[PDB]
Amino acid sequence: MNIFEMLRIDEGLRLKIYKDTEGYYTIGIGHLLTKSPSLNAAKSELDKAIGRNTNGVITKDEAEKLFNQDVDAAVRGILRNAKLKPVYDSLDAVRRAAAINMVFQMGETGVAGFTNSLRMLQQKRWDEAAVNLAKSRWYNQTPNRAKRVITTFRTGTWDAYK
Ligand SMILES: CCOc1ccccc1O
Ligand SMILES: CCOc1ccccc1O
User: Fold this and answer.
1) Where does substrate bind?
2) Do the beta carbons of residue 129 and residue 153 sit within 8 Å?
3) Contact between residue 27 and residue 16 where contact means Cβ atoms under 8 Å apart
4) 34, 57, 114, 126 - which has most CB atoms within 10 Å?
5) Backbone angles phi, psi at 5, to 5 degrees
6) Pocket of ligand 2 (CB under 6 A)
7) Ligand nearest to the CA of 153
8) Which of 97, 113, 105 is nearest to 152 (CA)?
9) In the β-sheet with 25-28, what is the strand arrangement from edge to edge?
10) Is 101 exposed, middle or buried (0-12, 13-18, 19+ CB in 10 A)?
11) Contact 30, 104 (CB under 8 A)
12) Which three-class secondary structure state does DSSP give residue 32?
């Protein structure tokens, strides 16, 4: 298991435009196109991302290319964030993957709400962190995914991903 396999499980793979759990146009492996309710606006973003007129469909290779970019961007974003970087650097590699997963799903804006969890994670108070993480809109709206990510933070193992 690694961050690519983990996110592939959590995000799935779809080669045509679809709406994610929040109702936003998405393609591939969790590649958010736009929060606009306009399908045309999403098709434009897709074409811009792929570099051709796609008509709302992409190949597996293209999906994977966007995915690699998205993962890279998530990590690079963490490292450029003065609040996230020190916590990220304090973690082992397994727990780092849990961190990347969260940023991938909700963005740096989304994880901004997690100040108290971040502190407990930097303190390595894993069970406390786990309890605090579940007290969230995130957990309530995507409980099964959140439980997997939380177990990963709690244990520093890949047990939740078999
Ligand atoms: C991972 C998303 O997969 C789908 C979404 C909407 C319709 C069919 C899908 O397989
Ligand atoms: C609760 C979110 O956890 C993290 C996110 C980004 C970097 C390090 C983290 O512990």
Assistant:
1) 32, 104, 117, 132
2) yes
3) yes
4) 114
5) -65, -35
6) 78, 84, 87-88, 99, 102-103, 111, 114, 117-118, 121
7) 2
8) 97
9) 14-19, 25-28, 31-32
10) buried
11) yes
12) strand
Q: Tell me, what amino acid is at 136?
A: S
C-alpha to C-alpha distances, 68 to 11, 31, 62, 72, nearest whole angstrom: 13, 10, 10, 6
**Rg for the chain, CA atoms, rounded:** 16
Please give the structure tokens belonging to residue 151.
């177990």
Token pair, residue 148, equals 């997997």
Binding site annotation covers 104?
Answer: yes
- The domains of the chain are located at 1-162
Among all bound ligands, the one having the nearest atom to the CA of 19 is: 1
Solved by what technique?
Answer: X-ray
DSSP labels for 73-120?
HHHHHHHH-TTHHHHHHHS-HHHHHHHHHHHHHHHHHHHGGGHHHHHH
According to the CATH classification, is domain 1-162 in 1.10.530.40?
yes
